Amino acid sequence: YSIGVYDRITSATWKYRNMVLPLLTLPERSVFVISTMSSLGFGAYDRYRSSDHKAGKALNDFVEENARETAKRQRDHYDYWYRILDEQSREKLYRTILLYDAYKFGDDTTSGKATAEAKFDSSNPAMKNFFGPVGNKVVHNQHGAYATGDGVYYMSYRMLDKDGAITYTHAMTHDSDQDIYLGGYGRRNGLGPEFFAKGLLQAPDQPSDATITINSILKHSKSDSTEGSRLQVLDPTERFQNAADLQNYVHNMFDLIYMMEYLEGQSIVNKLSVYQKMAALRKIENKYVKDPADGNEVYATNVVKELTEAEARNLNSFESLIDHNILSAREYQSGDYERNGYYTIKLFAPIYSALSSEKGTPGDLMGRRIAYELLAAKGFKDGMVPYISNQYEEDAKQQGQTINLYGKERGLVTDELVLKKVFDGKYKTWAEFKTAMYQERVDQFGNLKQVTFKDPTKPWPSYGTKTINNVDELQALMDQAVLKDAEGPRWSNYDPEIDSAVHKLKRAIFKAYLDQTNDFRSSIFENKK
Amino acid sequence: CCHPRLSLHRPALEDLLLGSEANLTCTLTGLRDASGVTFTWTPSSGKSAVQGPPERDLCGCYSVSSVLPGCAEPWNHGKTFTCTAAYPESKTPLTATLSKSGNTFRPEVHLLPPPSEELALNELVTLTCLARGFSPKDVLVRWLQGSQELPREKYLTWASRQEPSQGTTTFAVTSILRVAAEDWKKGDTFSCMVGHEALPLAFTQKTIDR
Amino acid sequence: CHPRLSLHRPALEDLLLGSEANLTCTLTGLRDASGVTFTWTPSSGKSAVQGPPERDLCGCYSVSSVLPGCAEPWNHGKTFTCTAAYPESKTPLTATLSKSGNTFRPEVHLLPPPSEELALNELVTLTCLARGFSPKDVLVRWLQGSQELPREKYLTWASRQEPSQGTTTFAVTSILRVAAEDWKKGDTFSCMVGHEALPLAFTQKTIDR
């Protein structure tokens, strides 16, 4: 329980306990120790010395303040994760795992973060007096960060920079997702370690990122220019006080997302030609491939393909979009996806698809989407943990559905079992669940909607407001924007991104609604809407 | 540079009735190949469409466009355009509204003697006669005051911008003309007009100066 | 791909009326990795925020930024040779907004001509053609009381060339047909021309008759 360093390194079952004697003898302040709840980071001052920061008062000032800020950010992150978990597994968020820095020290002549890996004979005081005495030969490749399971190592992302915490949350999720973030049960048999991290359970890479994430670390006030295109949570420790607050936040966010997606879908089937509908949409399916780890081929990988013309003409019904498993091509590539890949779902790119594997594992692109939707229906306990944490594995084995894992008979948690257990009487097929969510959202925004929506959707000369008051004007704007993308659809650059007008309108509406209230609390304007 | 797509095409009916060469090539972009691509027209009066002459635009090689660049009897009907010289890779549909004569307008020349405080000599007079007469941008709009064609430098098909007027509004192209003092005393004023796409010429000549 | 320079020509009149000065410099010619790095070699301490890049429809993505934040230099404008680092080439590329004073006096042309020829019984026309160019921006601006309308929505014709031999002159024609009732209603009746050097925005008459 102690946050004190000596009570951590001194304590038994520590990977590098001997790190106390070099630390007590360090001649000068050449190493920093960020000892927060559940982490014991060790860094060198020479890691941040460059041309901009010179050895002396400047380096000591840049490191001390940035280390204090990083400690505060990690403390806020674990405060959030402690407030969320309420299944008495929070008492296990006291493990200690070191966060060694790169060992790539930089002289005052180096322009940026130098890439000279030290060889353990380096004259740099940190290597000679501490990091070298506590030997820990690390692979030290030039770029990337990896979590060995018992620790975390930063090779490129500096631990003190603001981009250090966005990698810190990813590495921690890989390091402790088997008995910490989940209810206590291990990862799902099909999902890999990269599934529970980049797409879900990670802070967003950038504030203006249009991705479905939870800003649990970075606390950025409205003073910064980042307020433009915030598209995320203002304060993590303020917004999230318990699991109910997270469920409500995700519920409101997905309410707005479902409203926008239903508007775009109504724009698709009504005002769009056939040839334009071909390129505007794609079809997602699940392909089963043999994996080297396990002999069984029950695992499914998501594959995105161009839908045929025969399927395009049959997409007239909005319900059909969900049934024919079609997804928008604005942000999702046309190539086949892979398992355990750095794939995240975009915030404004609709996925009307409810594709579910009747086999054990959904995939990656479809897995994260449904999991976030389940978080809207039910909170992190129940909801998301059954979908991604195989806690219903034993039930599967008792009913049937066995799988040969490493030569032993084990339970195979299928999506059908997850659906029949989480929502036993409410739904029977994932398509029904998606349709019921859309219908609830429709009955919602048909009556109660805030008229205070301020979306410019225009060029550099400042445009003050559009003041949409009822969903009909917003649907008309969405129709006009979709028509515009179909016209002149060069798609020249590999990523159109912000250029497409449809994305501009969605981002504007999202930012307007986020700035209207303090945060995502409720998206329903209780009048004759 | 970055896509698979085109740009807006300027339908070519200007060459068909206002020029000796009846070219029928509406401007198209993103086509970098030989002119063997099929041409599709909603309504065809008689003769098959003829693709326009190769030119390089936006670092794009030999770009195809769509001709019947001289079917004058069929052109008189005014049936739409919506040029679609689609490439095999590109979507087949083409669409620029240009069917039966729409929003036709008459020329409104505005030429009057102008005071020249800065030009006491009177050798050169800067007069910008008022224009109109063409609702359709893709037309061989030319000015021919008198029975003799005016200055090669001053004679061309200048582009025009639609101007904010009561009721119907028609684009006008400025026609400033520089002539010698003897020509001014000649009384050979130059008429200024704009011609609609549906009409073969659609040019009206009426001007009075000094 | 290949770098290109386009004269943005930011309205001078809008900048004077506007609380915040409006100025922009952009370079076109980027065909490389999605990540883009842009920096300005010369900084006068004025705001230089960069807006999202806008495609030219031939691919070749090109970045942009603002040069706002200048209110003290009403007539003493800064240099216009932007140089921002890009992913395709580390060396900066010169951007020119062609900043030249070109000081000159502007006189417009108003004529009551052929009443029968220009009247449809209820048709009225006003003649104010812009003459005299000093800066790189010219507008056919018209004064319409205190009414405010979006600049982007309005569409107007560009500059014209009206230069006497041995002299440099520019033309803009501050003309857009509107009701002539205001002229006889006692309301302000002066066409507005935007010139930083001499933006009188009213008819000028020579002493000679």
mmCIF file of N, CA and C in Angstrom, chain B residues 83-188:
data_model
loop_
_atom_site.group_PDB
_atom_site.id
_atom_site.type_symbol
_atom_site.label_atom_id
_atom_site.label_comp_id
_atom_site.label_asym_id
_atom_site.label_seq_id
_atom_site.Cartn_x
_atom_site.Cartn_y
_atom_site.Cartn_z
ATOM 1 N N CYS B 83 -22.775 17.088 -70.399
ATOM 2 C CA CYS B 83 -21.676 16.357 -71.084
ATOM 3 C C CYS B 83 -21.121 15.264 -70.167
ATOM 4 N N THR B 84 -20.985 14.049 -70.712
ATOM 5 C CA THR B 84 -20.495 12.882 -69.931
ATOM 6 C C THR B 84 -19.476 12.059 -70.730
ATOM 7 N N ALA B 85 -18.289 12.627 -70.970
ATOM 8 C CA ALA B 85 -17.205 11.911 -71.680
ATOM 9 C C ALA B 85 -16.479 11.066 -70.633
ATOM 10 N N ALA B 86 -17.229 10.174 -69.980
ATOM 11 C CA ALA B 86 -16.694 9.335 -68.885
ATOM 12 C C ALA B 86 -15.568 8.427 -69.387
ATOM 13 N N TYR B 87 -14.526 8.286 -68.559
ATOM 14 C CA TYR B 87 -13.381 7.371 -68.816
ATOM 15 C C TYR B 87 -13.811 5.963 -68.377
ATOM 16 N N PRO B 88 -13.137 4.867 -68.789
ATOM 17 C CA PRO B 88 -13.568 3.529 -68.377
ATOM 18 C C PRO B 88 -13.511 3.366 -66.849
ATOM 19 N N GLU B 89 -12.424 3.837 -66.227
ATOM 20 C CA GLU B 89 -12.243 3.758 -64.750
ATOM 21 C C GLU B 89 -13.270 4.643 -64.028
ATOM 22 N N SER B 90 -13.529 5.837 -64.571
ATOM 23 C CA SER B 90 -14.453 6.837 -63.968
ATOM 24 C C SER B 90 -15.920 6.412 -64.110
ATOM 25 N N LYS B 91 -16.797 6.977 -63.271
ATOM 26 C CA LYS B 91 -18.251 6.667 -63.338
ATOM 27 C C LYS B 91 -18.781 7.149 -64.693
ATOM 28 N N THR B 92 -19.661 6.357 -65.318
ATOM 29 C CA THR B 92 -20.230 6.647 -66.665
ATOM 30 C C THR B 92 -21.074 7.931 -66.682
ATOM 31 N N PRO B 93 -21.908 8.225 -65.661
ATOM 32 C CA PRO B 93 -22.758 9.425 -65.682
ATOM 33 C C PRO B 93 -22.028 10.776 -65.760
ATOM 34 N N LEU B 94 -22.603 11.698 -66.542
ATOM 35 C CA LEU B 94 -22.106 13.088 -66.747
ATOM 36 C C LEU B 94 -23.284 14.036 -66.479
ATOM 37 N N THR B 95 -23.028 15.243 -65.942
ATOM 38 C CA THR B 95 -24.154 16.159 -65.584
ATOM 39 C C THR B 95 -23.737 17.620 -65.346
ATOM 40 N N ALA B 96 -24.013 18.486 -66.327
ATOM 41 C CA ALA B 96 -23.868 19.960 -66.250
ATOM 42 C C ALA B 96 -25.158 20.508 -66.875
ATOM 43 N N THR B 97 -26.035 21.162 -66.105
ATOM 44 C CA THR B 97 -27.375 21.510 -66.663
ATOM 45 C C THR B 97 -27.273 22.399 -67.908
ATOM 46 N N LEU B 98 -27.735 21.872 -69.047
ATOM 47 C CA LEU B 98 -27.694 22.583 -70.355
ATOM 48 C C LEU B 98 -28.612 21.857 -71.344
ATOM 49 N N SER B 99 -29.911 21.809 -71.038
ATOM 50 C CA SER B 99 -30.917 21.150 -71.912
ATOM 51 C C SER B 99 -31.591 22.225 -72.769
ATOM 52 N N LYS B 100 -32.928 22.239 -72.808
ATOM 53 C CA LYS B 100 -33.655 23.273 -73.591
ATOM 54 C C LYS B 100 -33.318 24.644 -72.991
ATOM 55 N N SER B 101 -33.130 25.651 -73.855
ATOM 56 C CA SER B 101 -32.882 27.093 -73.569
ATOM 57 C C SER B 101 -33.484 27.518 -72.225
ATOM 58 N N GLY B 102 -32.635 27.770 -71.224
ATOM 59 C CA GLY B 102 -33.118 28.184 -69.892
ATOM 60 C C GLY B 102 -32.595 29.551 -69.484
ATOM 61 N N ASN B 103 -33.474 30.391 -68.926
ATOM 62 C CA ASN B 103 -33.106 31.752 -68.447
ATOM 63 C C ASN B 103 -32.469 32.574 -69.577
ATOM 64 N N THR B 104 -33.026 32.500 -70.790
ATOM 65 C CA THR B 104 -32.481 33.278 -71.936
ATOM 66 C C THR B 104 -32.618 34.775 -71.631
ATOM 67 N N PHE B 105 -31.605 35.572 -71.991
ATOM 68 C CA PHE B 105 -31.620 37.035 -71.719
ATOM 69 C C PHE B 105 -31.158 37.813 -72.957
ATOM 70 N N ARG B 106 -31.544 39.091 -73.040
ATOM 71 C CA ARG B 106 -31.176 39.954 -74.196
ATOM 72 C C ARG B 106 -30.038 40.897 -73.795
ATOM 73 N N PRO B 107 -29.123 41.260 -74.723
ATOM 74 C CA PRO B 107 -28.008 42.163 -74.414
ATOM 75 C C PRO B 107 -28.498 43.572 -74.049
ATOM 76 N N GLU B 108 -27.811 44.223 -73.105
ATOM 77 C CA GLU B 108 -28.171 45.596 -72.659
ATOM 78 C C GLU B 108 -26.913 46.471 -72.694
ATOM 79 N N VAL B 109 -26.473 46.852 -73.897
ATOM 80 C CA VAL B 109 -25.245 47.686 -74.070
ATOM 81 C C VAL B 109 -25.467 49.051 -73.409
ATOM 82 N N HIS B 110 -24.430 49.576 -72.749
ATOM 83 C CA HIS B 110 -24.501 50.894 -72.062
ATOM 84 C C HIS B 110 -23.293 51.747 -72.466
ATOM 85 N N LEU B 111 -23.294 52.269 -73.696
ATOM 86 C CA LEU B 111 -22.164 53.105 -74.184
ATOM 87 C C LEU B 111 -22.646 54.540 -74.424
ATOM 88 N N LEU B 112 -21.956 55.511 -73.819
ATOM 89 C CA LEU B 112 -22.282 56.957 -73.958
ATOM 90 C C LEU B 112 -20.967 57.742 -73.994
ATOM 91 N N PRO B 113 -20.920 58.977 -74.542
ATOM 92 C CA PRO B 113 -19.668 59.734 -74.586
ATOM 93 C C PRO B 113 -19.176 59.950 -73.149
ATOM 94 N N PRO B 114 -17.876 59.727 -72.855
ATOM 95 C CA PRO B 114 -17.325 59.874 -71.510
ATOM 96 C C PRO B 114 -16.366 61.064 -71.378
ATOM 97 N N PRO B 115 -16.481 61.897 -70.319
ATOM 98 C CA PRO B 115 -15.575 63.033 -70.126
ATOM 99 C C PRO B 115 -14.146 62.507 -69.921
ATOM 100 N N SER B 116 -13.150 63.210 -70.469
ATOM 101 C CA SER B 116 -11.738 62.759 -70.353
ATOM 102 C C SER B 116 -10.856 63.893 -69.822
ATOM 103 N N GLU B 117 -10.977 64.189 -68.524
ATOM 104 C CA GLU B 117 -10.167 65.244 -67.861
ATOM 105 C C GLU B 117 -8.689 64.840 -67.911
ATOM 106 N N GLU B 118 -8.413 63.547 -67.707
ATOM 107 C CA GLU B 118 -7.030 62.994 -67.710
ATOM 108 C C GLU B 118 -6.543 62.745 -69.145
ATOM 109 N N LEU B 119 -7.437 62.840 -70.137
ATOM 110 C CA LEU B 119 -7.050 62.600 -71.554
ATOM 111 C C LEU B 119 -7.512 63.782 -72.415
ATOM 112 N N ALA B 120 -6.827 64.921 -72.282
ATOM 113 C CA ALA B 120 -7.121 66.165 -73.036
ATOM 114 C C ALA B 120 -6.880 65.960 -74.538
ATOM 115 N N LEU B 121 -5.856 65.176 -74.886
ATOM 116 C CA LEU B 121 -5.448 64.943 -76.300
ATOM 117 C C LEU B 121 -6.589 64.313 -77.109
ATOM 118 N N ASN B 122 -7.341 63.388 -76.488
ATOM 119 C CA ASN B 122 -8.510 62.639 -77.048
ATOM 120 C C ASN B 122 -8.053 61.521 -77.999
ATOM 121 N N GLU B 123 -6.751 61.214 -78.033
ATOM 122 C CA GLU B 123 -6.216 60.150 -78.926
ATOM 123 C C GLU B 123 -6.790 58.788 -78.518
ATOM 124 N N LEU B 124 -6.863 58.524 -77.208
ATOM 125 C CA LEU B 124 -7.388 57.230 -76.694
ATOM 126 C C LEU B 124 -8.530 57.493 -75.705
ATOM 127 N N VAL B 125 -9.646 56.776 -75.860
ATOM 128 C CA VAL B 125 -10.818 56.934 -74.945
ATOM 129 C C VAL B 125 -11.102 55.586 -74.273
ATOM 130 N N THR B 126 -11.215 55.582 -72.940
ATOM 131 C CA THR B 126 -11.477 54.334 -72.173
ATOM 132 C C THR B 126 -12.973 54.223 -71.857
ATOM 133 N N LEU B 127 -13.728 53.535 -72.720
ATOM 134 C CA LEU B 127 -15.190 53.346 -72.521
ATOM 135 C C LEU B 127 -15.479 51.847 -72.375
ATOM 136 N N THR B 128 -16.182 51.493 -71.294
ATOM 137 C CA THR B 128 -16.580 50.096 -70.984
ATOM 138 C C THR B 128 -18.091 49.985 -71.198
ATOM 139 N N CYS B 129 -18.495 49.643 -72.423
ATOM 140 C CA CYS B 129 -19.926 49.529 -72.800
ATOM 141 C C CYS B 129 -20.591 48.424 -71.975
ATOM 142 N N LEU B 130 -21.843 48.648 -71.568
ATOM 143 C CA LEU B 130 -22.606 47.643 -70.781
ATOM 144 C C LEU B 130 -22.900 46.434 -71.679
ATOM 145 N N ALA B 131 -22.937 45.238 -71.086
ATOM 146 C CA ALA B 131 -23.161 43.970 -71.822
ATOM 147 C C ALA B 131 -24.292 43.166 -71.167
ATOM 148 N N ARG B 132 -24.700 42.071 -71.834
ATOM 149 C CA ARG B 132 -25.746 41.073 -71.448
ATOM 150 C C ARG B 132 -25.967 40.132 -72.638
ATOM 151 N N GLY B 133 -27.112 39.439 -72.647
ATOM 152 C CA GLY B 133 -27.541 38.588 -73.775
ATOM 153 C C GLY B 133 -27.166 37.118 -73.690
ATOM 154 N N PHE B 134 -26.344 36.700 -72.725
ATOM 155 C CA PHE B 134 -26.047 35.244 -72.673
ATOM 156 C C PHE B 134 -26.211 34.699 -71.251
ATOM 157 N N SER B 135 -27.299 33.958 -71.008
ATOM 158 C CA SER B 135 -27.497 33.317 -69.683
ATOM 159 C C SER B 135 -26.408 32.254 -69.512
ATOM 160 N N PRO B 136 -26.056 31.412 -70.644
ATOM 161 C CA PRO B 136 -24.988 30.155 -71.055
ATOM 162 C C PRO B 136 -23.552 30.665 -71.241
ATOM 163 N N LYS B 137 -22.664 30.319 -70.305
ATOM 164 C CA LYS B 137 -21.241 30.761 -70.326
ATOM 165 C C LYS B 137 -20.495 30.203 -71.547
ATOM 166 N N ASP B 138 -20.766 28.952 -71.933
ATOM 167 C CA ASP B 138 -20.036 28.311 -73.062
ATOM 168 C C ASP B 138 -20.654 28.694 -74.413
ATOM 169 N N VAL B 139 -20.431 29.936 -74.858
ATOM 170 C CA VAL B 139 -20.935 30.418 -76.180
ATOM 171 C C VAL B 139 -19.878 31.344 -76.794
ATOM 172 N N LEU B 140 -19.802 31.388 -78.128
ATOM 173 C CA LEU B 140 -18.802 32.236 -78.829
ATOM 174 C C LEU B 140 -19.259 33.699 -78.806
ATOM 175 N N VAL B 141 -19.379 34.280 -77.608
ATOM 176 C CA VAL B 141 -19.816 35.699 -77.448
ATOM 177 C C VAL B 141 -18.742 36.612 -78.050
ATOM 178 N N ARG B 142 -19.068 37.286 -79.157
ATOM 179 C CA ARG B 142 -18.110 38.198 -79.837
ATOM 180 C C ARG B 142 -18.812 39.518 -80.173
ATOM 181 N N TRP B 143 -18.048 40.614 -80.235
ATOM 182 C CA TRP B 143 -18.609 41.950 -80.568
ATOM 183 C C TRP B 143 -18.115 42.365 -81.957
ATOM 184 N N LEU B 144 -19.039 42.715 -82.856
ATOM 185 C CA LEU B 144 -18.667 43.128 -84.236
ATOM 186 C C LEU B 144 -19.397 44.426 -84.596
ATOM 187 N N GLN B 145 -18.972 45.554 -84.016
ATOM 188 C CA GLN B 145 -19.619 46.858 -84.318
ATOM 189 C C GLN B 145 -19.389 47.185 -85.797
ATOM 190 N N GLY B 146 -20.439 47.633 -86.494
ATOM 191 C CA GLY B 146 -20.343 47.980 -87.926
ATOM 192 C C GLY B 146 -20.291 46.746 -88.815
ATOM 193 N N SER B 147 -19.910 46.929 -90.083
ATOM 194 C CA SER B 147 -19.800 45.801 -91.047
ATOM 195 C C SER B 147 -18.351 45.304 -91.109
ATOM 196 N N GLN B 148 -17.458 45.924 -90.330
ATOM 197 C CA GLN B 148 -16.016 45.550 -90.320
ATOM 198 C C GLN B 148 -15.616 45.054 -88.926
ATOM 199 N N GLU B 149 -14.894 43.930 -88.866
ATOM 200 C CA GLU B 149 -14.444 43.332 -87.579
ATOM 201 C C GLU B 149 -13.478 44.291 -86.870
ATOM 202 N N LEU B 150 -13.625 44.420 -85.547
ATOM 203 C CA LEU B 150 -12.774 45.303 -84.701
ATOM 204 C C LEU B 150 -11.435 44.617 -84.402
ATOM 205 N N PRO B 151 -10.322 45.381 -83.863
ATOM 206 C CA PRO B 151 -8.716 45.162 -83.370
ATOM 207 C C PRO B 151 -8.532 43.714 -82.895
ATOM 208 N N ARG B 152 -7.517 43.017 -83.415
ATOM 209 C CA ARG B 152 -7.286 41.593 -83.048
ATOM 210 C C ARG B 152 -7.012 41.492 -81.544
ATOM 211 N N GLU B 153 -6.229 42.427 -81.000
ATOM 212 C CA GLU B 153 -5.915 42.434 -79.546
ATOM 213 C C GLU B 153 -7.207 42.656 -78.751
ATOM 214 N N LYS B 154 -8.083 43.536 -79.251
ATOM 215 C CA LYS B 154 -9.354 43.882 -78.557
ATOM 216 C C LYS B 154 -10.485 42.908 -78.917
ATOM 217 N N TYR B 155 -10.270 41.992 -79.869
ATOM 218 C CA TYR B 155 -11.358 41.045 -80.240
ATOM 219 C C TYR B 155 -11.053 39.644 -79.696
ATOM 220 N N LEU B 156 -11.942 39.142 -78.832
ATOM 221 C CA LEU B 156 -11.804 37.801 -78.201
ATOM 222 C C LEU B 156 -13.133 37.409 -77.543
ATOM 223 N N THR B 157 -13.157 36.261 -76.858
ATOM 224 C CA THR B 157 -14.363 35.802 -76.117
ATOM 225 C C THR B 157 -14.091 35.959 -74.615
ATOM 226 N N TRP B 158 -14.186 37.190 -74.100
ATOM 227 C CA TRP B 158 -13.905 37.484 -72.667
ATOM 228 C C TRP B 158 -14.913 36.779 -71.751
ATOM 229 N N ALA B 159 -14.431 36.277 -70.608
ATOM 230 C CA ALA B 159 -15.285 35.619 -69.591
ATOM 231 C C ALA B 159 -16.119 36.691 -68.880
ATOM 232 N N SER B 160 -17.299 36.324 -68.370
ATOM 233 C CA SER B 160 -18.173 37.316 -67.688
ATOM 234 C C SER B 160 -18.616 36.801 -66.313
ATOM 235 N N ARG B 161 -19.052 37.710 -65.436
ATOM 236 C CA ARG B 161 -19.582 37.313 -64.104
ATOM 237 C C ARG B 161 -21.054 37.737 -64.020
ATOM 238 N N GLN B 162 -21.931 36.862 -63.512
ATOM 239 C CA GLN B 162 -23.373 37.215 -63.391
ATOM 240 C C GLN B 162 -23.503 38.398 -62.424
ATOM 241 N N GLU B 163 -24.317 39.395 -62.785
ATOM 242 C CA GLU B 163 -24.481 40.620 -61.954
ATOM 243 C C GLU B 163 -25.915 40.707 -61.421
ATOM 244 N N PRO B 164 -26.136 41.032 -60.022
ATOM 245 C CA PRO B 164 -27.419 41.290 -58.936
ATOM 246 C C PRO B 164 -28.350 42.380 -59.481
ATOM 247 N N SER B 165 -29.380 41.973 -60.229
ATOM 248 C CA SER B 165 -30.341 42.924 -60.846
ATOM 249 C C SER B 165 -31.776 42.474 -60.557
ATOM 250 N N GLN B 166 -32.737 43.397 -60.668
ATOM 251 C CA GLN B 166 -34.166 43.084 -60.401
ATOM 252 C C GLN B 166 -34.639 42.013 -61.391
ATOM 253 N N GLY B 167 -35.462 41.075 -60.915
ATOM 254 C CA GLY B 167 -35.974 39.967 -61.747
ATOM 255 C C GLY B 167 -34.851 39.092 -62.279
ATOM 256 N N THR B 168 -34.873 38.793 -63.582
ATOM 257 C CA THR B 168 -33.844 37.924 -64.218
ATOM 258 C C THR B 168 -32.476 38.617 -64.216
ATOM 259 N N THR B 169 -31.408 37.845 -63.990
ATOM 260 C CA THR B 169 -30.015 38.369 -63.983
ATOM 261 C C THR B 169 -29.187 37.601 -65.020
ATOM 262 N N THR B 170 -28.443 38.317 -65.870
ATOM 263 C CA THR B 170 -27.615 37.670 -66.926
ATOM 264 C C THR B 170 -26.162 38.152 -66.829
ATOM 265 N N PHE B 171 -25.204 37.237 -67.018
ATOM 266 C CA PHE B 171 -23.755 37.571 -66.961
ATOM 267 C C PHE B 171 -23.404 38.525 -68.110
ATOM 268 N N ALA B 172 -22.499 39.475 -67.849
ATOM 269 C CA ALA B 172 -22.072 40.462 -68.870
ATOM 270 C C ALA B 172 -20.542 40.491 -68.962
ATOM 271 N N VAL B 173 -20.006 40.640 -70.179
ATOM 272 C CA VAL B 173 -18.527 40.696 -70.391
ATOM 273 C C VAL B 173 -18.160 42.100 -70.889
ATOM 274 N N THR B 174 -17.222 42.763 -70.205
ATOM 275 C CA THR B 174 -16.796 44.142 -70.568
ATOM 276 C C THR B 174 -16.075 44.143 -71.923
ATOM 277 N N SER B 175 -16.302 45.176 -72.738
ATOM 278 C CA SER B 175 -15.666 45.239 -74.081
ATOM 279 C C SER B 175 -15.005 46.604 -74.299
ATOM 280 N N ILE B 176 -14.003 46.942 -73.480
ATOM 281 C CA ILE B 176 -13.294 48.244 -73.649
ATOM 282 C C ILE B 176 -12.599 48.211 -75.015
ATOM 283 N N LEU B 177 -12.712 49.295 -75.786
ATOM 284 C CA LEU B 177 -12.085 49.353 -77.134
ATOM 285 C C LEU B 177 -11.232 50.618 -77.256
ATOM 286 N N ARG B 178 -10.011 50.478 -77.781
ATOM 287 C CA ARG B 178 -9.112 51.646 -77.982
ATOM 288 C C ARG B 178 -9.007 51.905 -79.488
ATOM 289 N N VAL B 179 -9.343 53.125 -79.917
ATOM 290 C CA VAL B 179 -9.323 53.494 -81.364
ATOM 291 C C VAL B 179 -8.729 54.898 -81.516
ATOM 292 N N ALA B 180 -8.286 55.235 -82.731
ATOM 293 C CA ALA B 180 -7.676 56.548 -83.055
ATOM 294 C C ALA B 180 -8.736 57.658 -83.052
ATOM 295 N N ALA B 181 -8.292 58.914 -82.930
ATOM 296 C CA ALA B 181 -9.196 60.089 -82.879
ATOM 297 C C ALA B 181 -10.024 60.177 -84.168
ATOM 298 N N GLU B 182 -9.418 59.873 -85.321
ATOM 299 C CA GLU B 182 -10.141 59.905 -86.622
ATOM 300 C C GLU B 182 -11.283 58.881 -86.587
ATOM 301 N N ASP B 183 -11.034 57.703 -86.003
ATOM 302 C CA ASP B 183 -12.063 56.635 -85.893
ATOM 303 C C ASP B 183 -13.234 57.145 -85.043
ATOM 304 N N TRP B 184 -12.938 57.871 -83.958
ATOM 305 C CA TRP B 184 -14.005 58.411 -83.070
ATOM 306 C C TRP B 184 -14.876 59.393 -83.859
ATOM 307 N N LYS B 185 -14.240 60.263 -84.652
ATOM 308 C CA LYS B 185 -14.968 61.253 -85.491
ATOM 309 C C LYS B 185 -15.660 60.505 -86.637
ATOM 310 N N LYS B 186 -15.246 59.255 -86.871
ATOM 311 C CA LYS B 186 -15.818 58.382 -87.931
ATOM 312 C C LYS B 186 -17.295 58.112 -87.624
ATOM 313 N N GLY B 187 -17.629 57.942 -86.340
ATOM 314 C CA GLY B 187 -19.014 57.644 -85.926
ATOM 315 C C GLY B 187 -19.283 56.152 -85.954
ATOM 316 N N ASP B 188 -18.235 55.354 -86.185
ATOM 317 C CA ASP B 188 -18.360 53.874 -86.229
ATOM 318 C C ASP B 188 -18.295 53.332 -84.797
#
